[PDB]
Nucleic acid binder design. Structure first.
Ligand SMILES: [Mn+2]
Ligand SMILES: [Mn+2]
Ligand SMILES: [Mn+2]
Ligand SMILES: [Mn+2]
Ligand SMILES: [Mn+2]
Ligand SMILES: [Mn+2]
Ligand SMILES: [Mn+2]
Ligand SMILES: [Mn+2]
Lengths: 115, 116
DNA sequence: GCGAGGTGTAAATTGTCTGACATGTTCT
DNA sequence: AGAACATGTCAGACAATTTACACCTCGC
C-alpha cells in the first residue's frame, strides 16, 4: 500500500521525496534544494544515509551517473507515497469552498510558473 | 511572525497534528483518534500531549479549556499559515507538468464532492 | 598533480518516544 | 462512590543527527 509507506517517514525524508517528485537529482543537488527549504546548511552525513534508507524501502532508485555521482529518482512506490500524503493533506485542508478556491489558486499559479 | 521560520523544522508527527487541526479544532483525544486512523496503529497520549504543548509554545496551536478536564486545541493564525506554506511547498514540487496538475485537480474535485 | 566534487561512514551527542504511574473531572 | 474520560509527566529505551575523518573521481 502507498499509505503504509508514506506514514513512518521522517519529515526530512518526505522532503527528500517531494524534491525528487519535482525531478530526479544527484545527491548534492538534493542537498542544495533542502538547504533552500530549511534555510540551514544540510549535513551530507545526514542526507546520504537517509537516501540509502529510502532505497531499502523501495521508494528511491539509486543509479550511477558518474563513478563519483549518483542519480536518485522516485520509484513508482515512492511516487505513490508522495501522492498519498498529498491526498491526505488535501482531504483535510479542503474543508469548505474557500479552502478549495485557495488550493485552486495555488495550483493555477504553479501551472503558470511552468513557463 | 512568519510560519515558515517556525514550521519547517517540525517533526512529521507535529506536521500531522497541524494538518488534523487544519480541518477543524478538536479536543485532545479526538486528535489522537484521527492520527491513529492515519497511522493505522495506536498513538500514545504521552506522545501526543507534549507535542501539542510544543506546538503551543511555538505559537502554532492555541489551547483553550472546554470543561475543566478537556482542552480544545486549534490553529493560531500562524499555525494556519504553517499548514498553507507546507501545502504550497509540496504543490510547487508536485505540479511539474499538466498531468501532475490535473491529478491534483481531480483530487480537489473529489474532496469538494465529499463535502456535498 | 592538485584542488574541488561526490559520496561513504560512524562515535558521540542530541532528539524523541515508550511505557508507564498519576491526578483531577464528568457521568450515572 | 465507581468508572470511564482527559490530560499531565518522565525515566528508561530508542531514534536521530552532528562532526568529524576518509576514499575515489572528474576538471584544469
Ligand atoms: Mn546551501
Ligand atoms: Mn556537507
Ligand atoms: Mn486551478
Ligand atoms: Mn518540513
Ligand atoms: Mn514529534
Ligand atoms: Mn493512550
Ligand atoms: Mn512551508
Ligand atoms: Mn506558492
Amino acid at each position: 500500500d502507498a499509505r503504509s509507506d508514506a506514514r513512518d517517514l521522517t519529515a526530512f525524508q518526505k522532503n527528500i521525496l517531494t524534491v525528487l517528485g519535482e525531478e530526479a537529482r544527484y545527491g548534492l543537488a538534493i542537498k542544495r534544494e533542502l538547504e533552500e527549504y530549511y534555510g540551514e546548511e544540510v549535513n551530507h552525513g545526514r542526507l546520504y544515509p537517509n537516501l540509502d534508507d529510502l532505497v531499502n524501502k523501495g521508494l528511491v532508485e539509486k543509479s550511477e551517473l558518474d563513478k563519483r555521482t549518483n542519480e536518485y529518482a522516485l520509484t513508482n512506490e515512492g511516487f505513490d507515497a508522495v501522492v498519498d500524503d498529498l491526498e491526505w493533506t488535501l482531504s483535510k485542508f479542503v474543508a469548505d469552498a474557500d479552502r478549495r478556491e485557495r488550493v485552486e489558486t495555488i495550483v493555477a499559479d504553479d501551472a503558470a510558473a511552468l513557463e
